[PDB]
Scaffold this active site. Structure first.
Site, short mmCIF file in Angstrom:
data_model
loop_
_atom_site.label_atom_id
_atom_site.label_comp_id
_atom_site.label_asym_id
_atom_site.label_seq_id
_atom_site.Cartn_x
_atom_site.Cartn_y
_atom_site.Cartn_z
N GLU A 59 0.83 -1.11 -0.07
CA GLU A 59 -0.03 0.05 0.09
C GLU A 59 0.75 1.06 -0.12
O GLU A 59 1.96 1.01 0.45
CB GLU A 59 -0.88 -0.11 1.25
CG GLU A 59 -0.25 0.13 2.59
CD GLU A 59 -1.19 0.27 3.70
OE1 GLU A 59 -2.22 1.00 3.73
OE2 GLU A 59 -1.07 -0.71 4.61
N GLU A 77 1.21 8.35 1.84
CA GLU A 77 1.40 9.54 1.09
C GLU A 77 2.41 10.54 1.75
O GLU A 77 2.99 11.18 1.17
CB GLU A 77 0.12 10.25 0.60
CG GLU A 77 0.37 11.68 0.21
CD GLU A 77 -0.95 12.09 -0.29
OE1 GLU A 77 -2.00 11.75 -0.33
OE2 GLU A 77 -0.85 13.37 -0.98
N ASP A 130 13.28 -3.49 15.48
CA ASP A 130 13.82 -2.01 14.92
C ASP A 130 12.78 -1.13 14.94
O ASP A 130 12.69 -0.25 14.10
CB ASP A 130 14.26 -2.27 13.47
CG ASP A 130 15.21 -1.42 13.04
OD1 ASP A 130 15.69 -0.48 13.71
OD2 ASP A 130 15.33 -1.05 11.73
N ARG A 187 11.35 6.38 12.10
CA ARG A 187 11.71 6.34 10.85
C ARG A 187 11.31 5.03 10.20
O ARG A 187 11.31 4.86 8.93
CB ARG A 187 13.36 6.25 10.93
CG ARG A 187 13.87 4.89 11.58
CD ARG A 187 15.61 4.95 11.19
NE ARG A 187 16.00 3.90 11.68
CZ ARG A 187 16.22 3.71 13.07
NH1 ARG A 187 15.97 4.79 13.88
NH2 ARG A 187 17.00 2.62 13.35
N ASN A 188 10.84 4.16 10.79
CA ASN A 188 10.37 2.84 10.51
C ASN A 188 8.72 2.66 10.45
O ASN A 188 8.21 1.60 10.15
CB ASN A 188 11.00 1.69 11.01
CG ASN A 188 12.34 1.19 10.73
OD1 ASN A 188 12.90 1.71 9.38
ND2 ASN A 188 13.14 0.89 11.55
N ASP A 247 9.22 -2.05 7.77
CA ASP A 247 10.39 -2.38 8.28
C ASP A 247 10.61 -3.84 8.80
O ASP A 247 10.99 -4.08 9.67
CB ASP A 247 11.41 -1.64 8.91
CG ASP A 247 12.70 -1.92 9.28
OD1 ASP A 247 13.42 -2.08 8.42
OD2 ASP A 247 13.15 -1.93 10.24
C1 LIG Z 1 6.85 -1.68 -1.79
O1 LIG Z 1 7.47 -2.35 -0.60
C2 LIG Z 1 7.83 -1.74 0.64
C3 LIG Z 1 8.31 -2.53 1.69
C4 LIG Z 1 8.44 -1.76 2.81
C5 LIG Z 1 8.25 -0.13 3.01
C6 LIG Z 1 7.99 0.38 1.86
N1 LIG Z 1 7.57 1.65 1.62
C7 LIG Z 1 6.25 2.22 1.29
N2 LIG Z 1 5.21 1.36 1.27
C8 LIG Z 1 6.22 3.73 1.29
C9 LIG Z 1 5.45 4.87 1.22
N3 LIG Z 1 5.56 6.13 1.09
O2 LIG Z 1 4.26 4.29 0.81
C10 LIG Z 1 8.00 4.09 1.31
N4 LIG Z 1 8.57 5.25 1.43
C11 LIG Z 1 9.78 5.19 1.40
C12 LIG Z 1 10.76 6.66 1.23
C13 LIG Z 1 11.95 6.29 1.68
C14 LIG Z 1 12.65 4.88 1.74
C15 LIG Z 1 12.04 3.82 1.95
C16 LIG Z 1 10.64 3.89 1.74
N5 LIG Z 1 9.95 2.58 1.56
C17 LIG Z 1 8.51 2.82 1.73
C18 LIG Z 1 7.80 -0.33 0.68
#
Ligand SMILES: COc1cccc(-n2c(N)c(C(N)=O)c3nc4ccccc4nc32)c1
Length: 266
Positions: free
Chosen positions: A88, A91, A134, A138-139, A152
């Site tokens: 998902e 935003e 963790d 930030r996570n 995370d």
């Molecule tokens: C698509 O697989 C994954 C797994 C774990 C986390 C995320 N993940 C999301 N679902 C994000 C979101 N904004 O929806 C997002 N923004 C990020 C921004 C910076 C670094 C890692 C990120 N990682 C992110 C995505």
């Protein structure tokens, strides 16, 4: 993890850099034809087989959890390349960087709503036998409606016993949650600032704790101290934390009571 058909995935923009490749935002068409916003992680070209295993390992873990406050795995792409994880979309991104953009701009009840969501997600994780290890702002990811979700699947966030001898339990996650609570009420300040790691370890072991954030309700600072009890058996369980925050939401008036060294000796 559901195997997704790659023709159902559109990649629009890059929103970050991951350990194994790019993070993107985009769209996924569900079997029902509904189109949703998603985040997409891609495995870098020329990956090793270990990198592939570690990459997909996150999806395997995340896929075990179905909860409104845990990031939702939509699926994976493995039968074509690049290999992908799709979740998902959130935003407003990482919680700590989001709060840093809005110092002192949210109401206490808004902040407590965020915190309750995080606690509910952690309650489910611990229910399932998962120790996160963790847990940190930030996570946590936060969406357009300020709903917070654990992501995370770190000395400043780690309980003293986990630092001392790797005693990781749901109670060490409760410690981490206390730190997240401090982070949220501090609008994304770094825990223990830039103290040397050796001093964070020594100070906390000696009984020193992070000080109350500016204008922090007494009830919330006490909850931090409770999460930071030296004896891990004296820390609340996540179910109790959720209950505590639900009471504060129900009784917004209680949040109006506000609370030698930078750290305080508890
Ligand atoms: C698509 O697989 C994954 C797994 C774990 C986390 C995320 N993940 C999301 N679902 C994000 C979101 N904004 O929806 C997002 N923004 C990020 C921004 C910076 C670094 C890692 C990120 N990682 C992110 C995505």
């Amino acid at each position: 993890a559901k195997e997704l058909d790659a023709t159902n995935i559109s990649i629009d923009k890059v929103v970050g850099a991951g350990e194994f490749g790019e993070v993107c935002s985009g769209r996924l068409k569900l079997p029902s034809k509904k189109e949703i916003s998603v985040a997409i992680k891609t495995l870098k070209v020329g990956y090793t087989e270990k990198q592939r295993r570690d990459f997909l390992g996150e999806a395997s873990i995340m896929g075990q959890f179905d909860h409104p406050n845990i990031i939702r795995l939509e699926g994976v792409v493995t039968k074509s390349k690049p290999v992908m994880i799709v979740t998902e979309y959130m935003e407003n991104g990482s919680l700590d960087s989001f709060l840093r953009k809005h110092d002192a701009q949210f109401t206490v009840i808004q902040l407590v709503g965020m915190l309750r969501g995080i606690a509910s997600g952690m309650k489910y994780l611990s229910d399932m036998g998962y120790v996160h290890r963790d847990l940190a702002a930030r996570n946590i990811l936060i969406n357009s409606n300020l709903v917070c979700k654990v992501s995370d699947f770190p000395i400043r966030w780690t309980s003293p016993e986990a630092i001392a001898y790797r005693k990781f339990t749901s109670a060490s996650d409760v410690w981490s949650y206390g730190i997240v609570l401090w982070e949220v009420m501090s609008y994304g300040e770094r825990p223990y600032w830039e103290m040397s790691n050796q001093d964070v370890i020594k100070a906390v072991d000696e009984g020193y704790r992070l000080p109350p954030p500016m204008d922090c309700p007494a009830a919330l600072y006490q909850l931090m101290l409770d999460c930071w009890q030296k004896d891990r058996n004296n820390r609340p369980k996540f179910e109790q934390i959720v209950s505590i925050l639900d009471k504060l939401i129900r009784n917004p008036g209680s949040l109006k009571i506000i609370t030698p060294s930078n750290l305080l000796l508890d």
